[PDB]
Amino acid sequence: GTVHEKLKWAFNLYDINKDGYITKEEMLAIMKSIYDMMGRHTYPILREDAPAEHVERFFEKMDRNQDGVVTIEEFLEACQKDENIMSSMQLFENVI
Ligand SMILES: [Ca+2]
Ligand SMILES: [Ca+2]
């Protein structure tokens, strides 16, 4: 399956419009969509105590040029730069 093929797969599930640019609105839909059954006991890895907190940090580390939207080029470049972020994105694909 390779790692690169899996990276593009996650982006395809994120970018709803498939324009190569993931926006804040697109991220909100993902957080609401992928959040059904995330465990059976205790799984503290995303303490959502606010609607705007885990999005700013994720976007600040994703958007390279900081144009206001994340792109496939930046996401792929950042995914190979951070292990923590890449681990979280892998959970979304492994959640199904
Ligand atoms: Ca988009
Ligand atoms: Ca960008």
Query: What is the CA-atom radius of gyration, in angstroms?
Result: 13 Å
Give the percentage of residues in beta strands: under 5%
> How do the strands line up in the largest sheet?
1-2
Tell me the number of helical segments per DSSP (H or I, 4 or more residues long).
5
In the CATH hierarchy, the third-tier topology is known as Recoverin, domain 1
**Alpha-carbon distance between the two ends:** 16 Å
**Assigned CATH superfamily:** EF-hand
Number of domains: 1
The helix-and-strand class reads mainly alpha
Largest sheet: 2 strands, antiparallel
Query: Helix content range of the residues, please?
Result: 40-55%
Cofactors, ions, other ligands: calcium ion
What oligomeric state is this?
monomer
Tell me the number of strands: 2
CATH structural class: Mainly Alpha
Question: What descriptors fit this protein?
Answer:
96 residues; Recoverin, domain 1; 5 helices; mainly alpha
Describe this protein's structure.
The structure is a monomer. With 96 residues, the protein is mainly α. It has one domain: Orthogonal Bundle (Recoverin, domain 1). The chain is 52% helix and 4% strand. It is built from five helices and two strands. It has helices spanning 4-14, 24-33, 54-62, 72-79, 83-94, and strands at residues 21-22, 70-71. The radius of gyration is 13 Å and the shape is globular. The chain starts with a helix and ends with a helix. The chain binds calcium ion (CA) (2 copies). Residues 15, 17, 19, 21-23, 26 line the site of one calcium ion.
